[PDB]
Structure 1
């Protein structure tokens, strides 16, 4: 019933299209699409707090964390709202994204519209990296590509 979309681009050759769909406000969000230009393996994938791309992906700020929790993976109770885990690129450098999440929303209070979706340099350790940063950023490194999450038809 609600559809939103995000075009990912950045400083390098990473580019992607990510769709979000939510049947009812009380419902899970299905996330699908594709990103190309990636190194093979896991890349952290997060909604960041601001939909501000003024100075590139840096202006998006920290992970979207309306409930003031620590960083985790999407299956954890202890996570930021924006913690969508990792996407995986194949040897061709393509990640086919297929996620269902019940914490992000396209309505309500945990709404991600107007925020920024970011795909990161490195794997998100999902809060299990063994250092302080693990519970803040997941050590996923720099921001390869991003875009503002917008209302679709």
Structure 2
């Protein structure tokens, strides 16, 4: 089973380590993000593992299948759409999810792409804003990291 890791850093006090592994026929995503305002923050795989311009150079959500932005539970979602992380009152969010569209092998592999955590909540495509079906209207990028191969 392939194992990957991602260390989050950006123009904010937000930090965290995310681990990804193949488990059965899905990918299991786990970790903790700290330094967040309490509540929901958008969390996605973005297309490029490019940190030449902070988190901005990561580009948009990873979307190899040409879908609209949605919830993890939807069929019409970007491959990179992992919904929201929920920070407690102490500013810390813990992830423990299994996803069928995130891949660590094959044409839709996310190795070498980016994870991003956002300023605002991801509205799952349903907020009625111009960016809802593009980004979930999740606002700016607090921290990001390139997804790398680990032991």
**TM norm. shorter chain > 0.5:** yes
- Once the two structures are TM-superposed, the CA of residue 23 in structure 1 deviates from its matched residue by 3.2
After TM superposition, the structure 1 = structure 2 runs for residues 1-40 of structure 1, keeping only pairs within 5 Å, are 1-23=1-23, 27-40=25-38
After TM superposition, the structure 1 = structure 2 runs for residues 56-67 of structure 1, keeping only pairs within 5 Å, are 56-67=54-65
Residue of structure 2 equivalent to 1:49: 47
Residue of structure 2 equivalent to 1:148: 146
Cα deviation, 1:9-64, whole Å, max 9, x if unaligned, reads 0111000000001035xx11000000000000000000000000001000000100
Count residues with an aligned counterpart. Answer: 151
Q: Distance in 2 between matches of 1:135 and 1:23?
A: 30
Residue of structure 2 equivalent to 1:134: 132
Paired residue secondary structure (2:131) = helix
Runs of 4+ in 1 over 4 A off after TM superposition: none
CA-based RMSD: 0.8
Alignment TM-score, normalising by the size of structure 2: 0.98
Structure 2: stretches of 5+ with no match in the other structure: none
Alignment TM-score, normalising by the size of structure 1: 0.97
- Once the two structures are TM-superposed, the CA of residue 136 in structure 1 deviates from its matched residue by 0.3
